[PDB]
Amino acid sequence: DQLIASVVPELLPSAELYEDPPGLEPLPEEEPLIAKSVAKRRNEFITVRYCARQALSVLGIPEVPILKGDKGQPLWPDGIVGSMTHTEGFRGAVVGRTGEVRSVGIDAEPHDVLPNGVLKSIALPVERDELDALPAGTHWDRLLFCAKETTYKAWFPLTARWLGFEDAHITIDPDGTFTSRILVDGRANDGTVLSAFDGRWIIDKGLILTAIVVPKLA
Ligand SMILES: CC(C)(COP(=O)(O)OP(=O)(O)OC[C@H]1O[C@@H](n2cnc3c(N)ncnc32)[C@H](O)[C@@H]1OP(=O)(O)O)[C@@H](O)C(=O)NCCC(=O)NCCS
Ligand SMILES: [Mg+2]
C-alpha cells in the first residue's frame, strides 16, 4: 500500500505519513534548524524526521538527531545511508546500512504539470522529444523533474559534488523504471566512478514517488 515500500528493496526500511499528526516535536539539537521557519516548513521537517526515526529503529538505531550538512544533505549515523522527501500530502524517509547498499535517494512530487518555464530549465532537448513520445495520461514532465531530483539525492552522498539538471539524461519507462546517465565526470569520493543509475517510480494518491538505490559494489 505504501509508496516508498513499492519502489525500494525490502532491506531498506521506510516510513511515510500523508498528514502532520498532532503533537510531534523536533529533537532539541534539531530545533535551531527551523527556529525561524514558517509553519509549513517546520511541519515537513518534523514529520519527515519522525518517519526517518521510525525506519532507523527497524535497523536497531535508537533516537538520534538528523541534522543538515553544508549543501543541505541529511547527516546520518555512521554506517547508515538514507533519504527524505516532503511535499503537500507526503512525508517519507528510507534508510539502509552501508554494508547492504551504497546510496539511496527518494523524491515525492505532486502529479501535476510542471510550472510554466520549468521544463525548459530542467530537460535536455532530447528529453523533451522523448517525453512527447510517451503514452498519454501521465505528467511525464513532472516525472522527469522528480527523477532528476532523486538522481541528485543518490549522487551527492557518494560524490560531495553538484549535479545539475543538464548533467544527467533520464529515460523514463512506462513500466515503472527509469535510468539516469551521468554526462559529467563521475568520480566518487572513494575513487570509484558513477556513470548510470537505475530507478523506480510509482504514481498514487495524486503523487509521484521516484527512488534510486545504488547497489552494493559487485
Ligand atoms: C535538494 C533537492 C534535490 C530537494 O528535492 P525537492 O524535491 O526540492 O525536496 P524534497 O522535499 O523531495 O527533499 C528535501 C530533502 O532533501 C534532502 N537533501 C537536501 N539537500 C540534499 C543533498 N545535497 N543531498 C541529499 N539529500 C539532500 C534533505 O533531507 C531535505 O529535507 P530536510 O531539509 O527536511 O532535511 C532540490 O531542492 C534541489 O536543490 N535540486 C537541485 C539539484 C538537482 O535536483 N539536480 C538534478 C540532478 S539530474
Ligand atoms: Mg519533491
Coordinates of N, CA, C and O in Angstrom, one line a residue, residues 102 155 158-159 161 185-195 214-215 217-218:
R102 N 24.9 1.1 -1.3 CA 25.9 2.2 -1.3 C 25.2 3.6 -1.1 O 25.8 4.4 -0.4
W155 N 23.3 10.7 -5.8 CA 24.7 11.0 -6.2 C 25.4 11.8 -5.1 O 26.6 11.5 -4.9
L158 N 27.6 10.2 -2.4 CA 28.8 9.4 -2.9 C 29.9 10.3 -3.5 O 31.0 9.8 -3.6
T159 N 29.5 11.5 -3.9 CA 30.5 12.4 -4.6 C 30.8 13.7 -3.9 O 31.8 14.3 -4.2
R161 N 29.5 16.5 -4.7 CA 29.6 17.4 -5.8 C 28.2 17.8 -6.3 O 27.3 16.9 -6.3
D185 N 31.9 14.2 -15.4 CA 32.8 13.2 -14.7 C 32.1 12.6 -13.5 O 31.5 13.3 -12.7
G186 N 32.3 11.3 -13.4 CA 31.5 10.6 -12.3 C 32.4 10.1 -11.2 O 31.9 9.3 -10.4
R187 N 33.5 10.7 -10.9 CA 34.4 10.3 -9.9 C 33.7 10.4 -8.5 O 33.2 11.5 -8.2
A188 N 33.8 9.4 -7.7 CA 33.1 9.4 -6.4 C 34.2 9.5 -5.3 O 35.4 9.4 -5.6
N189 N 33.8 9.8 -4.1 CA 34.7 10.2 -3.0 C 35.7 9.1 -2.8 O 36.8 9.3 -2.4
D190 N 35.3 7.8 -2.9 CA 36.2 6.7 -2.6 C 37.0 6.2 -3.8 O 37.7 5.2 -3.7
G191 N 37.0 6.9 -4.9 CA 37.8 6.6 -6.1 C 37.1 5.8 -7.2 O 37.6 5.7 -8.3
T192 N 35.9 5.3 -6.9 CA 35.1 4.6 -8.0 C 34.5 5.6 -8.9 O 34.6 6.9 -8.7
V193 N 33.8 5.2 -10.0 CA 33.2 6.0 -10.9 C 31.7 5.7 -11.0 O 31.3 4.5 -11.2
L194 N 30.9 6.7 -11.0 CA 29.4 6.6 -11.2 C 29.1 7.0 -12.6 O 29.6 8.1 -13.0
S195 N 28.4 6.2 -13.4 CA 28.1 6.6 -14.8 C 26.6 6.4 -15.0 O 26.1 7.2 -15.9
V214 N 21.6 2.8 -5.2 CA 22.9 2.4 -5.8 C 23.3 1.1 -5.1 O 23.6 1.1 -3.9
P215 N 23.4 0.0 -5.8 CA 23.6 -1.3 -5.1 C 25.0 -1.5 -4.6 O 25.9 -0.8 -5.1
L217 N 28.6 -2.8 -4.2 CA 29.6 -3.0 -5.2 C 29.7 -4.4 -5.6 O 29.8 -5.3 -4.8
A218 N 29.6 -4.7 -6.9 CA 29.6 -6.0 -7.5 C 31.0 -6.6 -7.4 O 31.3 -7.5 -6.7

